[PDB]
Amino acid sequence: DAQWLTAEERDQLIPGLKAAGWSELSERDAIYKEFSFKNFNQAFGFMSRVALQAEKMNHHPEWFNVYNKVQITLTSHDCGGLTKRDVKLAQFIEKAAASL
Amino acid sequence: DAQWLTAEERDQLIPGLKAAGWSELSERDAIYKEFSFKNFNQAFGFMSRVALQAEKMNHHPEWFNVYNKVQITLTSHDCGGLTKRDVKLAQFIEKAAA
Amino acid sequence: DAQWLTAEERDQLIPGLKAAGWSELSERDAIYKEFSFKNFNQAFGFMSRVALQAEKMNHHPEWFNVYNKVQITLTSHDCGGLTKRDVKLAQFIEKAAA
Amino acid sequence: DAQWLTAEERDQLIPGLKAAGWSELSERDAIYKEFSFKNFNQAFGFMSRVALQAEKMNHHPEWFNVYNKVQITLTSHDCGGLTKRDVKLAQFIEKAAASL
């Protein structure tokens, strides 16, 4: 999905992400979550998996990393809002963070 | 190097990095530079090379990435300032970016 | 492309790759090339770029690595032969290696 | 350790690796193990972690990858045999494969 999520889609997709720890940013139609690992080795291994998925689906995250911390913000710049692509990427990220 | 850069060291090593595009932050004793690649494939390949060097040196960057852009801030948190480790990592980053 | 390369396609696309250092295996319809970098940092950075492209194309290489060396064999297992996917991945590999 | 493992060291270090699935190659003083993941994404994420450790310890593996399979052979070419460095790398690899 390249268009903004509908009210119905948000009610059916966001609750699960919120339950997983993601939050909706106050200033942008985007979701955000910070992941913490044991060290940089584990953090970057995680980032490499996310990077691979980003190229597989042609959708990229905004992210900041400092050693074992990875802060991720997902939104679609081509339309300026949250799309199904962001939800899909978030779901993959949760799998990667859980080693699944 | 693990100790803060002396005045002489800064004069000898920082100008080259500034000529290469790095700048010194005003609120912190740290250097910064935004790199712009063609796409994320190039950007992450570059990040992977920097990540390898980070573990080789046990010195890590503070960095942000969005598609083809990579913003890097370097400083030594252990002593709260710039050290030769930051200079060496920045020099490696320049080679990897080229 | 997902179907086996035709005679015309092979004549049009393979010579360039051979000029670049790729060779055709004798026991399989596949192309091969060993890349030699300066070190593992360069080699793995290169591998990371190829890995990203592999997932973008959903087409994977058969590769071996030891420090600065990376041996790559390309073929399409789905049909047991060379396809345009192999040619396109090889061309990307050439750019990444440069 | 940059020298070959002693008979004593082999008796105290190899059993654990054998128990983990590693085997001693017949033609070389090296250890070998094949790892299988769900897909290439997981396999390469694993490889990135191993790559990071290889640069951290300045010791590199011989490895072959085809999609979800990663075959790893560990030995020290600077002396032509198995060293403490190979054991250390093997132990890290086991952690990475287990997501630890």
Q: What is the 3-state secondary structure (H, E, C) of D38-92?
A: CCHHHHHHHHHHHHHHHHHHCCCCEEEEECCEEEEEECECCCCECEHHHHHHHHH
Return the residue in A39, A42, A44, A48 with the most chain D beta carbons within 10 A, the one to mutate for interface testing.
A48
HSE toward the beta carbon, residue A4, CA cutoff 13 A? 8
Rg, C-alpha atoms of chain C? 13
| C56 interface with D at CB cutoff 8 Å | no
Phi-psi region of C6 (alpha: psi -120 to 50; beta: other; left: phi over 0): beta
Please name which of C10, C15, C21 lies closest in space to residue C81, comparing C-alpha atoms: C10
Please name which of C9, C10, C43 lies closest in space to residue C24, comparing C-alpha atoms: C10
CB A13 within 8 A of CB A81: no
For chain A, the chains sharing at least 3 beta-carbon pairs closer than 8 angstroms are B, C, D
Domain extents for chain A?
Answer: 1-100
Experimental technique behind these coordinates: X-ray
The H or E element containing residue C50 is helix C40-57
CB C4 within 8 A of CB C14: no
Distance from the Cα of C51 to chain A's closest Cα (Å) equals 7
Distance CA B60, CA C21 (A): 37
Distance CA B23, CA B19 (A): 9
Q: Which amino acid, D29? A: D
Distance CA B41, CA D35 (A): 26
For chain B, the chains sharing at least 3 beta-carbon pairs closer than 8 angstroms are A, C, D
Three-point CA angle B55, B58, B64, nearest 5°? 70
Q: Which residues of D touch C73 (CB under 8 A)?
A: none
Q: What is the edge-to-edge ordering of all strands in the sheet holding C23-24?
A: C23-24, C31-36, C69-74, C62-66, D62-66, D69-74, D31-36, D23-24
Distance CA A54, CA D44 (A): 14
Read off the tokens for C10.
Answer: 């092979």
Q: What is the dihedral of CA B90, B94, B95, B96, to 10 degrees?
A: 90
Distance CA B41, CA D18 (A): 39
Q: Which residue of A has its CA nearest to D39?
A: A100
Distance from the Cα of D35 to chain A's closest Cα (Å) equals 15
| D47 interface with B at CB cutoff 8 Å | no
Determine the number of helices (DSSP H) and then strands (DSSP E) in chain A: 3, 4
Q: Candidates 3.30.1360.20, 3.40.50.12500, 3.40.1160.10, 3.40.50.720; correct CATH number of B1-98?
A: 3.30.1360.20
- Helix/strand/coil for B35: strand
Q: Which class does domain A1-100 fall in?
A: alpha beta
Q: What is the dihedral of CA B35, A56, D63, D98, to 10 degrees?
A: 100
CA B89 → CA A50, B50, B83, B95, D17, distances in Å? 25, 8, 10, 10, 36
Three-point CA angle D78, D84, D86, nearest 5°? 65
Distance CA D62, CA C69 (A): 10
Q: In the A/C pair of chains, how many CB contacts fall below 8 A?
A: 15
CB A63 within 8 A of CB A73: yes
Question: For strand B31-36 and strand C62-66, is the pairing parallel, antiparallel, or unpaired?
Answer: unpaired
CB B65 within 8 A of CB B92: no
Residue A21, φ and ψ in degrees, nearest 5:
115, 0
